[PDB]
Design an enzyme around this catalytic site. Structure first.
Site, PDB file in Angstrom:
ATOM      1  N   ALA A  12       0.867  -1.204   0.000  1.00  0.00           N
ATOM      2  CA  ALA A  12       0.000   0.000   0.000  1.00  0.00           C
ATOM      3  C   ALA A  12       0.898   1.246   0.000  1.00  0.00           C
ATOM      4  O   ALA A  12       0.644   2.147  -0.815  1.00  0.00           O
ATOM      5  CB  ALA A  12      -0.954  -0.013   1.168  1.00  0.00           C
ATOM      6  N   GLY A  14       4.817   2.623  -0.735  1.00  0.00           N
ATOM      7  CA  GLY A  14       6.053   2.340  -1.495  1.00  0.00           C
ATOM      8  C   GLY A  14       6.091   0.936  -2.082  1.00  0.00           C
ATOM      9  O   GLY A  14       5.072   0.491  -2.664  1.00  0.00           O
ATOM     10  N   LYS A  31      11.068  -3.296   3.263  1.00  0.00           N
ATOM     11  CA  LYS A  31      10.126  -2.323   2.661  1.00  0.00           C
ATOM     12  C   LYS A  31      10.777  -0.944   2.723  1.00  0.00           C
ATOM     13  O   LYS A  31      11.080  -0.485   3.844  1.00  0.00           O
ATOM     14  CB  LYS A  31       8.773  -2.340   3.376  1.00  0.00           C
ATOM     15  CG  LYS A  31       7.601  -1.942   2.493  1.00  0.00           C
ATOM     16  CD  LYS A  31       6.618  -1.029   3.172  1.00  0.00           C
ATOM     17  CE  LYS A  31       5.185  -1.318   2.781  1.00  0.00           C
ATOM     18  NZ  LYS A  31       4.297  -1.241   3.962  1.00  0.00           N
ATOM     19  N   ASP A 115      -6.804  -5.945   4.526  1.00  0.00           N
ATOM     20  CA  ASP A 115      -6.445  -6.289   3.132  1.00  0.00           C
ATOM     21  C   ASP A 115      -6.001  -7.752   3.030  1.00  0.00           C
ATOM     22  O   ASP A 115      -4.909  -8.027   2.503  1.00  0.00           O
ATOM     23  CB  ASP A 115      -5.423  -5.295   2.585  1.00  0.00           C
ATOM     24  CG  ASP A 115      -5.459  -5.152   1.064  1.00  0.00           C
ATOM     25  OD1 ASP A 115      -6.534  -5.470   0.406  1.00  0.00           O
ATOM     26  OD2 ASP A 115      -4.436  -4.733   0.545  1.00  0.00           O
TER      27      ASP A 115
END
Ligand SMILES: C[C@@H]1CCCN1c1c(C#N)c2c(N)nc(Nc3cnn(C)c3)nc2n1C
Length: 255
Positions: A12, A14, A31, A115
């Site tokens: 969601a 980068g 991340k 999600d």
């Protein structure tokens, strides 16, 4: 120190790259985020379960932050789903057991994912399901008080109908719904609808109980009975996880 060797996917926020240590050859997932992040880190540190990605640590270079996570040897559940086929029903049942355990844990510590979909369910060396990507995750229970959600987010084919139609809604039934769409994906290798809206013909077909069409045709009657209890439009009538754990197919010995 670290060589971004392969790009793994877009979160969601980068992207996440497979980083290799240039001193040990350590393959790890990181991340990268240049400049809610306060929140995604806070939540990752709360997380301790066999069915949730292992959280390593974080470091800042200016307004660029670094999150390290247990690399998944197995990759994603999405890659184990054969389009138009799915996977063997026993493998689907085991992954669904582990997804429920992950979700029971998260809800237990008042966290909602928001999600759940095959792209965010990772597999380890021995094929254990790990729930990853907490960029949409938030607290829905604190000091034993439930907070209703009012932010629309997720992926449209996975989101519960109440999230399209209600000003406010309970977090837990939204995660359960997405677990139902995932179970559908695992047993049929296709998603039933673009979004669960009154305008969507596949979703209307499901409400009117036409399970002689796809993808429900390809699903044995036992798991479809369970999908009947999960994909219920009114979130208050939708089965809860305690009651999924009493489901016949859920407790059916398989293989
Ligand atoms: C779950 C998130 C969404 C965006 C991409 N993504 C991730 C990981 C995370 N977090 C992740 C990870 N930790 N490990 C692996 N391993 C992998 C990937 N491909 N293969 C063959 C093995 N993948 C991750 N992905 C995709």
């Amino acid at each position: 120190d670290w060589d971004l060797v392969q790009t793994l996917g877009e979160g969601a926020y980068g992207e996440v790259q497979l980083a290799v240590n240039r001193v040990t050859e350590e393959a790890v997932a990181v991340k990268i985020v240049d400049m809610n992040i306060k929140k995604e880190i806070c939540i990752l540190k709360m997380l301790n379960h066999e069915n949730v990605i292992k959280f390593y640590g974080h470091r800042r270079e200016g307004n660029i932050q670094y999150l390290f996570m247990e690399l998944a040897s197995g990759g994603s559940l999405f890659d184990r789903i054969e389009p138009d086929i799915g996977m063997p029903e026993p493998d689907a049942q085991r992954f669904f057991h582990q997804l429920m355990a992950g979700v029971v844990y998260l809800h237990g510590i008042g966290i909602t994912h928001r999600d759940i979909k095959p792209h965010n369910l990772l597999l380890d060396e021995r094929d254990n399901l790990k729930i990853a990507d907490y960029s949409l995750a938030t607290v829905f229970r604190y000091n034993n008080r439930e907070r209703l959600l009012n932010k629309m987010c997720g992926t449209l084919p996975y989101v519960a109908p109440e999230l399209l139609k209600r000003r406010e809604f309970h977090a837990e039934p939204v995660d359960v719904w997405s677990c139902g769409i995932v179970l559908t994906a695992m047993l049929a290798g296709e998603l039933p609808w673009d979004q669960p809206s009154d305008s969507c013909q596949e979703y209307s077909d499901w409400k009117e109980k036409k399970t002689y069409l796809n993808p429900w045709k390809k699903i044995d009657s036992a798991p479809l009975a369970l999908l009947h209890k999960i994909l219920v439009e009114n979130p208050s009538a939708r089965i809860t996880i305690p009651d999924i754990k009493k489901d016949r197919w859920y407790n059916k010995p398989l293989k």
